[PDB]
């Protein structure tokens, strides 16, 4: 429905142009490598990755980070603001340690993603789009994540957890807040996009380099 997030920035004690932000020397080396991937006359093309890098260092993107990215790449700050507000993966507000994203589009909705959403809500005691008091977990609804075959699915900190049941997501949350790393992927003895039982295709061993190459080649 409604987005709920504003696209106007108002200066705040913890979000203002004087908020401290600076890349680390290692991140500066990574930025240099990023910029070296584009033609010499087009350095603005590096806006999308470098901005992402800033978030990967900070967790979110204060207005100071956008200003720093604009200064580094010699791009006007309004262009960086445009990019930061256009793309939904950019966090213009602090989020929890683990960002939980539940796909609710029709393919996942058909396989009961509502049960996963309700189980997460009950386990964490927070509404969608709200961050726990502890701040480790943040929950939001996302569109199709490209894993509709393994549905219902969840993305936590660029990790995919698939074939979820309420118990599966409860255990994932329990071992996430216990300091452990859950195994990403499906949770039905499947571990890929193959059929759940039988392996109807690709059972014979694959063949070698020159199996069916044409003549005169």
């Amino acid at each position: 429905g409604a987005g709920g997030a504003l696209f106007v920035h108002r200066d705040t004690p913890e979000n203002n142009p004087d908020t401290p932000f600076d890349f680390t020397p290692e991140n500066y080396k990574r930025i240099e490598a990023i910029v070296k991937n584009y033609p010499e006359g087009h350095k603005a093309a590096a806006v999308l990755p470098v901005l992402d890098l800033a978030q990967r260092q900070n967790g979110w993107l204060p207005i100071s980070a956008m200003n720093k990215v604009a200064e580094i790449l010699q791009v006007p700050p309004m262009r960086v603001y445009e990019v930061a507000t256009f793309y939904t993966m950019y966090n213009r507000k602090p989020v929890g340690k683990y960002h939980i994203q539940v796909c609710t589009t029709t393919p996942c909705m058909l396989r009961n993603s509502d049960s996963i959403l309700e189980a997460i809500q009950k386990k964490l005691g927070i509404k969608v789009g709200e961050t726990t008091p502890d701040k480790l977990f943040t929950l939001i609804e996302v569109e199709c994540l490209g894993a509709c075959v393994n549905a219902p699915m969840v993305q936590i900190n660029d990790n995919y957890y698939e074939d979820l049941t309420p118990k599966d997501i409860e255990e994932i949350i329990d071992e996430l807040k216990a300091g452990k790393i859950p195994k990403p992927g499906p949770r039905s003895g499947r571990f890929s996009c193959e059929p759940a039982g039988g392996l109807t295709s690709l059972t014979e061993p694959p063949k070698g380099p020159g199996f069916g190459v044409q003549a005169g080649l």
């Binding site: 429905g1 991937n37 584009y38 033609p39 006359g41 603005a44 093309a45 999308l48 990755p49 901005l51 992402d52 791009v75 262009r79 445009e82 990019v83 256009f86 793309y87 939904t88 993966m89 950019y90 609710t104 589009t105 029709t106 393919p107 909705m109 058909l110 569109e143 199709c144 994540l145 490209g146 894993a147 509709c148 075959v149 393994n150 549905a151 993305q155 660029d158 995919y160 890929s192 996009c193 193959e194 059929p195 759940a196 039982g197 039988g198 109807t200 295709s201 690709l202 059972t203 014979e204 694959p206 063949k207 070698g208 380099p209 020159g210 199996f211 069916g212 190459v213 044409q214 080649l217």
Partner: protein
């Protein structure tokens, strides 16, 4: 017996993506074991004209979803140089709901994609390849980068790729959560550091593309099948499927099926055979089927009566008023609220519209509100016709095809399930005086 008339059963020896399920090593050693990077030097030295001719005689059509003939599109870039560099852009955004094929291609055999990038760049005379991978596919992008690193150390790409004397680079660029960035021009704009807003055509990318240079945007499946087509010949690829519907295809069957999965199958396989053979059949039996969306959210849905004999290719699905799209089959059984499903798709399109042009930006939101009211039943039957007209005012009037992809699902729902909407409005009126 020439001119086969029944399709839908090809054995493993004729399958291109032999590591679809990730049961073998995705690294360089496994790829070479399965026939990847074999005799690429000879193919490169055959020249761009030979490669373009093989792609043309193969009958390969764009696997992104539009089905444009690939040979002609790639030969659009066969002009003499004018000073600007030439580029190949591989589309790996994968935003269409129901579609999961390119993720498996990227993560389980990225070397096929890299070799296809090299072959396509040679055919187009491109200096380098840019792969625009979806920002949410972090592990897949990392696997692709590892494969690219292995190819770079093996001499298969870079300075003097193989022993052909051809210089070629591959770069991976990640998006940040935008479905519209799957459109080729919006993808180019996102690469250049701008918002993912499509640009008008003409000019086409072959004339003015990324950085204002000639470029070709191709789907990852289209790029990845090309080296196999070159090695085995265009005739072998054209032997499968009907005329003008050649080759094999990846299918993602999801929704109300016993075993949702991703498979590789001949093109013109009937939908019922595919569903009951690879997906374990519809949940509750074939008689429990209500509707099928055959080619992703942008294609109109078809009722069970049409799915009994329809074939899974471009022409047959066009004659069924539904299109093939990305070959992402979404199955809805008789327990499905079809209105709620279509309204959820319209909500997805409302959240994915880039907002550039008036018809999409305003009308998609308008149809979202109308469908939300349709779900409850607040509306009156006349509004249905109004909704139809509204969709007609969006389709064919926008910059890009996202407006069409939002207009078509409501058109299908109205075409095939109008009595459901009417009876919902009747029940709402009778319940609320």
């Amino acid at each position: 017996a020439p001119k086969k008339t029944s399709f839908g059963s090809l054995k493993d020896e004729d399958r291109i993506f032999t590591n679809l399920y990730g049961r073998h090593d995705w690294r360089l050693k496994g790829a070479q074991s399965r026939g990847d990077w074999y005799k690429t030097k000879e193919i490169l030295l055959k020249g761009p004209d030979w490669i373009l001719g093989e792609v043309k005689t193969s009958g390969l059509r764009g696997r992104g979803g539009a089905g444009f003939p690939t040979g002609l599109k790639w030969s659009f870039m066969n002009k003499p140089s004018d000073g600007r560099p030439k580029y190949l852009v591989v589309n790996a955004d994968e935003g269409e709901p129901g579609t999961c094929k390119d993720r498996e291609i990227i993560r389980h055999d990225p070397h096929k994609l890299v070799e296809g990038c090299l072959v396509g760049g040679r055919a187009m005379g491109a200096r380098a390849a840019y792969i625009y991978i979806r920002g949410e596919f972090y592990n897949e992008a990392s696997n692709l980068q590892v494969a690219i690193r292995e190819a770079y150390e093996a001499g298969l790409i870079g300075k003097n790729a193989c022993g052909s004397g051809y210089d070629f680079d591959v770069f991976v660029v990640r998006g940040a959560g935008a479905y519209i960035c799957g459109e080729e021009t919006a993808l180019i704009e996102s690469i250049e550091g701008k918002q993912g807003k499509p640009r008008l055509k003409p000019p086409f990318p072959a004339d003015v593309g990324v950085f204002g240079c000639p470029t070709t945007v191709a789907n990852v499946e289209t790029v990845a099948v090309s080296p196999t087509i070159c090695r085995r010949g265009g005739a072998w690829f054209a032997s499968f499927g009907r005329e003008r519907n050649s080759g094999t295809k990846l299918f993602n069957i999801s929704g109300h099926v016993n075993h949702p999965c991703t498979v590789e199958e001949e093109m013109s396989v009937p939908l019922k055979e595919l569903i009951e053979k690879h997906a374990g059949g519809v949940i509750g039996g074939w008689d429990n089927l209500l509707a099928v969306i055959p080619g992703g959210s942008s294609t109109p849905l078809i009722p069970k009566s049409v799915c009994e004999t329809v074939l899974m290719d471009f022409d047959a699905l066009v004659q069924a008023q539904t299109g093939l799209g990305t070959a992402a089959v979404i199955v809805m059984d008789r327990s499905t609220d079809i209105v709620k499903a279509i309204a959820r798709l319209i909500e997805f399109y409302k959240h994915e519209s880039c907002g550039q042009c008036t018809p999409c930006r305003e009308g998609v939101d308008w149809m979202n509100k109308v469908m939300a009211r349709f779900v409850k039943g607040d509306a009156r039957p006349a509004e249905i016709d109004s909704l139809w007209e509204i969709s007609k005012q969006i389709e064919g009037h926008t910059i890009c095809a996202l407006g069409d992809g939002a207009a078509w699902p409501v058109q299908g729902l109205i075409r095939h399930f109008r009595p459901e909407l009417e009876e919902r409005m009747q029940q709402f009126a009778l319940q609320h005086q």
